[PDB]
Amino acid sequence: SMEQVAMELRLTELTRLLRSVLDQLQDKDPARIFAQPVSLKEVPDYLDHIKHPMDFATMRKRLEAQGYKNLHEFEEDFDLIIDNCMKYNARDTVFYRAAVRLRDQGGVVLRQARREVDSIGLE
């Protein structure tokens, strides 16, 4: 149907915006601490601690499959990256501190992304 096509165009448009958001968020992680999934070879007990692992590569895979239907879903996954890190790692670690900085700098980006999604009407 034409309605289905129109919905699909909206999703494609949302995916384009979220790709730009994802790139901007990842730029705030210059150390690439959050670029890849935590390796279960290097951290064999990780899943005992963290029940829903997340990272930027995994987000990008979901994104390019158009698997984010709205901004909330995307934000959920970004928050997992930060929140998982801040639980597994202690305050005095480079990992925890990187997550704090990513959260703080990312907030700016996500604030305007919400306005753009609303204004253009992408969800």
Swiss-Prot record:
It is found in: Nucleus; Chromosome. Residues 9-113 form the Bromo domain. There is a cross-link at K41 (Glycyl lysine isopeptide (Lys-Gly) (interchain with G-Cter in SUMO2)). Highly expressed in testis. Component of some HBO1 complex composed of KAT7/HBO1, MEAF6, ING4 and BRD1/BRPF2. Component of the MOZ/MORF complex composed at least of ING5, KAT6A, KAT6B, MEAF6 and one of BRPF1, BRD1/BRPF2 and BRPF3. Interacts (via PHD-type zinc finger domain) with unmodified histone H3. Interacts (via PWWP domain) with dimethylated and trimethylated 'Lys-79' on histone H3. Scaffold subunit of various histone acetyltransferase (HAT) complexes, such as the MOZ/MORF and HBO1 complexes, that acts as a regulator of hematopoiesis. Plays a key role in HBO1 complex by directing KAT7/HBO1 specificity towards histone H3 'Lys-14' acetylation (H3K14ac), thereby promoting erythroid differentiation. This is Bromodomain-containing protein 1. It comes from Homo sapiens (Human). The gene is BRD1.
